[PDB]
C-alpha cells in the first residue's frame, strides 16, 4: 500500500494527461428566438423548437 519511492512530477503530469475535460463542441440556434442553447434542451428563456414551452 505504501510507496517505495515518491512519484516524480513528470509521472504526476502524465497521469493528469487524461484529466482535461471536453470543451463545448458547438451550440444550436433556436428557430424563433435565435438564442444559443444546448442541443435538445430548452432555452434559458423557455423556448424550444419555436414554441414557448414554459412560462418565463
Amino acid at each position: 500500500a505504501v510507496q517505495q519511492n515518491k512519484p516524480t512530477r513528470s509521472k504526476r503530469g502524465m497521469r493528469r494527461s487524461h484529466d482535461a475535460l471536453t470543451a463545448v463542441t458547438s451550440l444550436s440556434v433556436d428557430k424563433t428566438s435565435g438564442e444559443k442553447h444546448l442541443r435538445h434542451h430548452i432555452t434559458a428563456d423557455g423556448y424550444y423548437r419555436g414554441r414557448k414551452v414554459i412560462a418565463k
Binding site: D19, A20, L21, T22, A23, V24, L27, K36, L38
Partner: protein, 110 residues
Amino acid sequence: METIAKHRHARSSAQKVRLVADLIRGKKVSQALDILTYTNKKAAVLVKKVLESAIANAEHNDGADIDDLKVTKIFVDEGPSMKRIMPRAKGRADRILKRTSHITVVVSDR
C-alpha cells in the same frame, strides 16, 4: 492593447480551475463565454466572471471592441493556503489545506 482581469484568493484549488482554464485558452472571447456557460463545474462560474470583467475592462478602460478580443493568456496560480485542523481517529490530528488560487485572464484584440 492587452487587458487583464484577476480574481485573487479564489476559494478553489488551482488544479480544479486549470481544468476549466485550459478549455478557453486562445479562443475568441465570444466562443469562450459559450464554452464556460455550458461547463458544469464550479470553476466555470469563477472563470466566467473574471473573463467578463476583462471584457468590460477592455471596453471601458481601453476602448477595445468586443468583436475582436480573444483570450491570449489565462493561467491559475496557487494562492495562500488557510490551514485547518481536523480531528482523526485515536486522537491523531491532520492539517487540511483550504487551498485558494489566483485566476488571471488576459484578453486582447491581437
